Amino acid sequence: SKIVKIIGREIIDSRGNPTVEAEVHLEGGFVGMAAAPSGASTGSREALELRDGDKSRFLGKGVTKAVAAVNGPIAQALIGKDAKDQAGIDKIMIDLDGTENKSKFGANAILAVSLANAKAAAAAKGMPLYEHIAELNGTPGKYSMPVPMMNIINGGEHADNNVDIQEFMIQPVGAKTVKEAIRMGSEVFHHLAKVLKAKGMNTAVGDEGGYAPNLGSNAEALAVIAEAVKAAGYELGKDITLAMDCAASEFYKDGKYVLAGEGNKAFTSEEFTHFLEELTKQYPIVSIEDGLDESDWDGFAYQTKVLGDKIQLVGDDLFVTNTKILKEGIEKGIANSILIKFNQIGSLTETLAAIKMAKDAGYTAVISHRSGETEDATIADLAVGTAAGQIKTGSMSRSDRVAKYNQLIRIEEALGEKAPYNGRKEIKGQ
Amino acid sequence: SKIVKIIGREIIDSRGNPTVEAEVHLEGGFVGMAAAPSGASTGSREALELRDGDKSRFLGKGVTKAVAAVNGPIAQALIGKDAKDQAGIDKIMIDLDGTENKSKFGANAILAVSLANAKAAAAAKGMPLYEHIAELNGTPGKYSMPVPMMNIINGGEHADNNVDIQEFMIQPVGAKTVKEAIRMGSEVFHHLAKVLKAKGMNTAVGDEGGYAPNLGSNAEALAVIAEAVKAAGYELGKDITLAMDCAASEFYKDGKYVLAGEGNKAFTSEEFTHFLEELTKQYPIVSIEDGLDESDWDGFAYQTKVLGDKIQLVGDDLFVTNTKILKEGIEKGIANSILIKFNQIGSLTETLAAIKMAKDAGYTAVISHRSGETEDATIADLAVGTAAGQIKTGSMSRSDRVAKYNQLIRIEEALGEKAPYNGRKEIKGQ
Ligand SMILES: [Mg+2]
Ligand SMILES: [Mg+2]
């Protein structure tokens, strides 16, 4: 219906840093509240989030400016508009901003309202968000419960150990329902902690709820995980598959990839692609995110030609949820998958556009969370509403992560067979 | 106001363990949803939460039984009843259970429904939860934003260090509103990280979202904290006071109290009462939770006459949220504050009763959280709706904690001046 009021406030995320949370009100008492995850405040590739440089507030990470944009212009600009029309609401906001990277109001402001709007509209139509999204996509009944790749071991910049891979994940492909999948992840999660304690390592979770023990090498990280899956009564490859985020840009120096977890050995773009290939042979690894540097396109073309047929090559920093970039990659045969971060683009409309493009190209879409999350679980409704097939929302710890898993349980509970859990079949190259 | 549907489900908590969530649907489209925090499966004092005990699932932590109780007997015994009468809804459940500790259906099953019911009624009356609560309490006008005692440094059995005290907290008493108080904690929280980071300490957070560094003594814990508050641009005592949870139950043996942190040593219950009296002199510690074992009632009598004058004696494991125990305590002059955990009693009606008896005796009530939380932020609306003045819901990390604060912010933004932030005045003993 019609928007009669838009409220914007400043709340705290899962890491203690401020963030925006819109609240679109429609005629009839209907309301839709949503928050925005942490994003990049700097850079010339992705939509930036506006934070106040005010160092006398949250060490300079406040978002009153962005919040002001919501209450100020954004509000008055959306008042009277038909929230039911998503593309339109996201259009009159991105244009008002004027800039391309949404620097004026900030992506953390446009997204907050963008989502809140969708939820508000979904309420007026007497239906869940995942149902409304499906309609906006033009695929109403087309649902599916996303196969989750759960963070379990952290390394690189997200840890202080001899592990290069930023994060190791597990995928309960053997499950028949997302509910069973979540349980499997929980059990392995707790069993890993047992293995880490026996090894005298720290079991204190991280930002994503996973463990960041001081492992002496990449192999050890893969070993502790393998031992966990077994102790949990599951078989590697059959019940659980392994996914990973290399974040290769982190260990890319002087045109080469230096892995400290490999004894500080150096690898050329081509050599690393073969190093990963060898890993996918000794381990059930079926998904590799950012296996190379975002600029190493020539290398990605090679990695895709060698792994793209059997292993899913997900681009995170490579595509930064951008249609232009992803479009070029598709034509140049770069990768075969993309990680979706709606806060990295700004709106739901654009996010949907990115998911559709990947689908049309044969690429897989992995709806992802962010390091700084909130109670919000929109990505859960987004994954199901667009039948993304896969989701990346953390480990089985910390509500900022588990909130998404609980939402998936609620959703699958109300959809049953209407939203099947395809497991492996969702993973490219499977 | 008429209950038409009530469904229960098994969800995951912030710790990866299963928990119960319930939905109470009322005639007219009104629905309330709430989940219970993790409690105690056994025990002979507090309400017992029901767990399946099947090693095959969730390592025996499944709650399918308690979930059935909600969907089956409980629901069938509530259909058509007036959800608007909280006291009536809980009675039917309490009597249907037929046990003291609610060990038949499980405190978690009843609690989840009891809270979902209240949230449903609130909506049916076109009013928020905190407003419905205040009314059920018989004080529709009273409102107040509680002073949050944010955890920040854990010890004892809550960390692998040398600190005997279970947890150290900070209280943003220097704030004018809970919103600002939250900002203070957020700031203090982040600075302590730099202090530990620079000291080669681990910054990984615990279940509470706080820090578990490898400190060498209680004095050092109070050192890094104080050093953190100052570095943040705040002054102890004036802007940020201190609170701690001794949990003497962890080091109480042979009638004495041992302290590994203070080297192999232990002293009479009388000495420890004076030991703490020293900390309340050297440091701005105004709140001490379980400064003695729950059995040492005589010791508490002295501590109440030694510190009960200028220090707040919060009873957690002492009262375990139970009127039968708090009453006898008030008479014998034991403590002057009680930690409120509704999942420890079983229902909202019984929880309000506990809070009422607290204020009716001068004692202060601290709406608390549990180790295993969820996206649920009910305790936030409970504190306000009852003007408890104090709340213990973790640090400024992990959405399972910050969810409560964000809700507190949303509330203070709606009530405005109606919900005052008394500040240090709330703390019993000022
Ligand atoms: Mg990444
Ligand atoms: Mg306690």
Swiss-Prot record, chains A, B:
The keyword Secreted applies. Its main location: cytoplasm. Keywords: Cytoplasm, Glycolysis, Lyase, Magnesium, Metal-binding, Secreted. Pathway: Carbohydrate degradation; glycolysis; pyruvate from D-glyceraldehyde 3-phosphate: step 4/5. One of its GO terms (molecular function) is phosphopyruvate hydratase activity. Binds a second Mg(2+) ion via substrate during catalysis. It is found in: Cytoplasm; Secreted; Cell surface. Coiled coil: none annotated. It comes from the Bacteria. Mg(2+) binds at residues 245, 289, 316. The active site is at 208 (proton donor), 341 (proton acceptor). Its EC number is 4.2.1.11. Component of the RNA degradosome, a multiprotein complex involved in RNA processing and mRNA degradation. Catalyzes the reversible conversion of 2-phosphoglycerate (2-PG) into phosphoenolpyruvate (PEP). It is essential for the degradation of carbohydrates via glycolysis. This is Enolase. The gene is eno.
